[model samples]
Target: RDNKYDILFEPVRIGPHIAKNRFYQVPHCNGGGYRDPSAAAAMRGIKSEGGWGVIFTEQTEMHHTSEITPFIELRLWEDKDIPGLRRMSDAMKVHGALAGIQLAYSGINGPNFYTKEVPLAPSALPIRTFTNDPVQARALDKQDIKNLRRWFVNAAKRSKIAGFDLICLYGAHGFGIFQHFLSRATNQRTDEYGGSLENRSRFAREVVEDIKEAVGDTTAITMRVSREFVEMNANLPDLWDLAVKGIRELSSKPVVGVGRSPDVMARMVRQGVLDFIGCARPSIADPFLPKKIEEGRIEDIRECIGCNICITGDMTMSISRCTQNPTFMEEWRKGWHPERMNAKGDSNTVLVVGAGPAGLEATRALSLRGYDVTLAEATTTLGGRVARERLLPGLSAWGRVVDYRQYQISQRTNVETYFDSRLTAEDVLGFGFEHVAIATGSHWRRDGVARQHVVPMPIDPSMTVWTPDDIMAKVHPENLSGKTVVVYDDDHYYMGGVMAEVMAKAGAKVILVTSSAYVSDWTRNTLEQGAIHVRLDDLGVDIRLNRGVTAIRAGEVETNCVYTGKRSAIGCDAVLMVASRTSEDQLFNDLIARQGDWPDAGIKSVKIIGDAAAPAPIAWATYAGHRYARELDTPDIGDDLPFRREVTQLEP
Candidate 1:
């Protein structure tokens, strides 16, 4: 196998300990899986089993300074929190993976989420760009900075007491101490702790210095810093670009660089800026990344694709999801092992309709599980819209469906591919296959009505309008030097943010219009949303929120209040509309009608997931695929199929 000794699998020593591979499980807050000892232990325990060399419990706050979004971040300020942290440490060590703890202050990121207290940062900036709850964040005076340093030192001692091998100072992504150290947008002050590079970096260094004094060599320490502040007014390119080098200059601790990009990671490593590169989004997409790099197949590696879907999507009770890697969110409840194969035995002819993600996942699962499957696509090519989407620059990561899976499917002799074959109800049932799974995916509306309610249709796509997906095709708006661009988002998914980024990058004076009380309502993670907000603000995007469209007139988009239907209008050059997607159940319905056996059973199966299912996060699509297939392959009890409703009647 080309994967032999994949750089990913090669062990590296950090501090006094060793990791099994380069694939360190990044700092992720578990979805209350850890709140239950068994569930949290099992989740962390499984990562150790899965060959993750370094695993860390999420965001342990020290000295009442750590504030996280909600109910479950591991707290370690007091001695009481040590036992849970200690138990988690022991669990990973049993599997030979060194346990690391990420100690974060949450800074301004917290208090806003958990308690009424406003979070403390280096400066008193607004909590979020969209809101006016100016959190008069406390700037660290000389004494205050000294006190924070002591807190970190004490935290490190506590982590050491709890048996964690590595201590990570989360000074990155507007969290912990780094939020003040690097961001010009968030950090505005005249003191030595704020003005110059030395001033800006003073607090972070003080904390690290303190931590070194407290725990010493017992814990391998690393620093995490955000790549850039997203806000234009508060930029950090110069400060952070130098901070990487500065941290290396100030301390002997290894710096683990965290960001959304991977192609540039090797460069950061080569620059000797960090000891090792860390990827949160990319690692989520492919856990096997290290192996790919070590084998000299860098281009072949599935990029992180940087959608922030896995983190943000999970925040909304959506589970962890990724746009590029469809299998992300189902890591727990679905028991989805991305690389696992299905049962193999008793070759059965299977007909899988549709070439989209759902169909592709189903075909892959069935084929791997030992079912002789034949996949038929309505299009000429295999990988549904996703495959087609990968053609775009920066989106090539989307092609993993074809790049990785095609290789696996081609190896299976039982799996046959039929392209450009659109199967009808009669043709599918006539084949008389033992199993038939219709993977036919859904589509968006060409003509817009008020979404699910069918109120007066918003500007139709035919009327010089565009959908979010349509904008992705050719994102840059042309010839609009002085024209107004308004983005109406009822979809509230990440795609809107993605489009907003694309639009802002394209030099459009943009207005982000949404009907919800909160702009970017779909963005679940505060940190990720904060990062996105920073970028959008940098591009000078105007955010108009909590307003509804009452009507659309020539060169103007009218809006009504979210609470009352009171109207307002804004003149616009062009309009991009993003709303909820309705299920395209025409074929699914047709298939159900033809079955004539169990109308309800057919209807239930046709129930769409992903975008089609309630405009949900992408993670659910992966879960839907995994759960649906896992259940289908489940051996039936007794003589009858468990899932089969016994085809009582096609209709009532």
Candidate 2:
């Protein structure tokens, strides 16, 4: 076989199946998989069409016992589930791609990650909180092990029945069967299946063997094992390098999964330590990874920034999209295929207002579609408050969202960027644009006497010591040696914890105060929040749980119970106020009030987006910006029509 992309594109065979290239699409959570089968089919179908030689469906369960809710995890536990699985496989097959199904058993990490079901581990010593429902899991008994293995066998049989080319074991991502089989944290059983590493490895290897027996060589087998637990290194006292040296012996089939480093994966694949190298984050960052290297465009490839924005954002269903790519959600819609946008929208003159996340995305989307476009920003530079936030420590990764978009926009000949140039109503009317979208994003400001923005809102600069934005501009935790530090959080999510981590790391005694029941609001915090708290504890911060600040003085911070009125006072060093931010929609409201019109007929156009539309994460902003332009592009493509229509002969 001729080698391409150095060694990456070498022809490889798994069981009876031979892939044209070594690059394979690993199974992942498709946001559509949970709700819309057509959407899910479209997603896999697109990937298959994208030249992925082998495409794996999202995880599916074997039997009714598995907890599958909005589950996105397709299940063939029963015969009724078979047709849907078959559709997925058949759809992939139509694109000349080999379809595969990943079989999974939730085990312990399942219930926690999924949240609706109670988890069953090899021996439960509590894995992590499953979200708001922190239910402790029961240990799996001998019978439970047998049943789970049977589930594996049945799942494989169904995959074979559905014509899947392969069946991958769910043994990674600290979830499903692998979580119980791989980690000592859960497997402390006193029985035959616990204690030693071999015993710990027994169940996983047995499941693979059982599946092989169930499906024979027709269905290729693959195992995904997490090589290192990064969060464990951060939270657990003792860390053992996973037994990768031993895992090679555990499976005769290919073991495919992500490791901490590319070199770790490359070394494993080259030395046959693992039969194949599978990457989740890397693939998310650059779906054309194998081909990029094949063409020697490795440097041009955007690396997975590892901000956990993609990983962590998904855990919340905060729109299961990638932060690096920004267009991951548009795989099926918005005509934003990675290769190119439709040339149909090319010759039109389009105007994108605002340099915020949404505006930038809209400009890029239109430009790629081959439109004569101008992305005009009122500010001196691109990227609104998002750019400001990126300048802060620990928030730098967020910059990639704007940086990547701006770089791509600049390279496109059709895109003309105008900064500090406000296109007025007269200019728009005179220009007679075919389409215009105002992506003027929401503005962030302090509110209340404690916090506010530039207006007469909260947290006035003269009133409070400093705003999160202001203090972040020149934050030095060490500067306050003996003073108490109070960080009032209303932007209460990962930002508070991020700030806390930074402050604690910089030798500050941080007291993170927020008016919320749970810490790290809106974030998938069961995994990271605990680690953040531990770091704060290590830094000697006395964390006050369920407390709300009632008053703030120069030397002391006063608080009342979040649920009760019991007041307490904390001596303060620096008071950093973080208040609820309002979306700057004055321009939007003013435009509408000044000239009443539907989208484009009046006063050029003004659109509210991102936080202005509603307080949201970065994903929402990019999605809002991109979608606004998409919807405003002349006539809509799929506008409120039934997906498929029934046909009948009226004459008959």
Candidate 3:
């Protein structure tokens, strides 16, 4: 053990098992667990190897009654499920980490879409569906409660047999039956398991007792208790005071909780607030966080940005992605590791134009792969659009996309960076580099051609119009105080909502108009839509929905309904268009035109990447950069079958 972080490296006892360290990976939905066992195993195995004490599978549904469809949660209903679970446990244990399976029964939260069965709940209540459909969950009878206890016991036995060292009794996240039974809002009955808090806690207690008896001395039982805070203090370690107090009284087993607490986690553990530092999103952002701390490289750790882009995968029913850690959920398919990379192939020199997210990542990865990389930027500062966008309210954490790459690139001796070094095709061709990569980024459109409006909106010469770029550059219209600013959001991303907020805070009477059903509709996937709406409402911004701005006149903007063909006009002082962005790919195009002169100049290839190739989420740009570095000097895999596909068996 090291001197500074020796406490973090100490082993802790949990029931019959022992953790190698204090870093515990809590259960998290990856959207590929049940269907793709190999992928899931590889993902978890890498986390274990990175120094997590305990690695957990996503919440595993014990029976078909609690199945959440369209979400690829882990399952263990019968013997057929044992093999897949065994794969996960074996993979994790090989790295000297305890493998845990979170056993859950989603009571009212279960839609039962695939099973076509009624959802079971503590009391009769309407079950919430993904599409907001009306469906009632049937209340569990005495016999049904007995059946659930048996189901939990049977699942615990199966988990033990599958080589799992730990089992999580998931009574958290408002998803499981334990939470429903515990809440007075959900459980209302004359039966023994209602009214008093003790009675309400009976169901969770019984399940715990039953599982302990069934898998006695074979597996450790840990409870994950998620709770909503009445008051939040970012400085405090014990945020879930009620949960910890209740769980301690209810059970003799160890308890774990989730939150963004690294320094606070150790304090909590010392004070007996929790047995381990439970983390999921933090682990995704930096798998080597524990190792970094262990080696006294805390400053080198890549902290999570809390963007919730990882949570978007579950809502969107896709593989999870992280903005800070682009290699997330690509361990097996892409053969990418979070903390490691393939060996360098050659000593080729590569030139990366633009110091944006894409170029920074490419330069960092190439330098790590033993290539001499020079990153050139036109602006005096680095980070391109990322640097500007992070200046928006509540988006400062997003700047880590630049911070992480910039730090890594700075540490490498093979990488050189130059600011205010814009180069044309002629200058680039004369540089004598083996390869050139263009990531010049993109610019927002002022013509207002966006998702809902394909045609450019007509604007009067007297009216003032602005794009996001203009606002980000601090170029505002004259005498903006007490003026009415009309924000036309056709892009449906965060920029629209952010611009409106910025204008409103600047003393402008802001009117945010959108073609979508809600403002910043795409953020629902990013887990920020609810907060976005609340913030906008508190700021008194007038939101107009399902309307497209058609024309900007002298003192007002004409709008048309996207669905119903209705027309209206709203008075405004200035128009801010949050529409499409055009890529600055002129250098790439020029280089493409001068391809015949490449051989003499020692240039092997010219590639366009990031927003300059096609504007996407910053995560995609990082992935593109890493991919380019990984595939450098390798033979082309071809367009028809670019990536590996995980196929399922079909009935003949």
lDDT by residue (tens digit), candidate 1, 1-652: 2433333355677766776765566677644422443334445655565456777776677757546545456677678677767878887788788898888776655555555554677776555423354455665567776777777788888899989988877765555557656777777878877776666676766666677666656777665455222221122211121124345555444445555534455555555665555545555566555545655655545555555665554364333455545544343434555556445544356677776766666666677677777788877877766765565434566666555566656767878899888887666656666567666665544454544337546563333567755664564454456766777777664555656656666666788877775556656463455555666777788877777665556788888777777888888777777665556456566766766643423322333333333434434454455455566645556885432111122544
Instruction: By lDDT, rank the candidates, best first.
Output: 3, 2, 1
Worst 10 residues of 3 by lDDT: 230-239
Model 1 poorest ten-residue lDDT run: 233-242
Best by TM-score: 3
- Specify the highest-lDDT model's number: 3
Provide the global lDDT of candidate 1 against the true structure: 0.61
Q: What tens-digit string does per-residue lDDT give for candidate 2 at 1-652? A: 1232345555667777877665567777655553445555655666665556677877776655545353455667666667767878887788666787877766654553444455677776554535434455788888888887887787777778888988777666577767675677777876777876667777866776787777766877765555333321221111111215544544344444444233454556677765455555666666666555556655445566556665553465433566566556456444455545554443367777788777787787777666778877887878876787786655777787788788878788998888777766555555556566766665334443322123343222333355655655564544665555677665666666666665666666788887776566655432556666676677776666677766666577678787778888877766666655666666556556656443354234456667767766766777777666555545645776423322332654
lDDT of each: 0.61, 0.63, 0.82
Alpha-carbon lDDT of model 2: 0.63
Provide the lDDT at 71 for model 1.
Answer: 41
lDDT of 3 by residue, 1-652 (tens): 2353566777877777788988888888775778777778888888887889889899899988887787778889889889889989998888789998888898888888888877999899888555675788899999999999999999999999899988887777676898899888889966998987667877877787787787867777666666222112111111121225644444444556667635676777777777668788889999888878777777778889888888888777778888777777788877888878788876489999998888888888888889999888998888988899899877898898888888888899998888878899999999989999999999998887877667777889788888989998889853468799999998887889999988988889999999888889999887788889889989988999998888889999999998988899999989998999899999999999999999999999999998999998888888888888887887666775654457775758
Full-model lDDT, candidate 3: 0.82
Q: State TM-scores per candidate.
A: 0.73, 0.80, 0.95
Alpha carbon deviation, residue 51, candidate 3 (Å): 0.4
Output the lDDT of residue 290, model 1.
Answer: 52
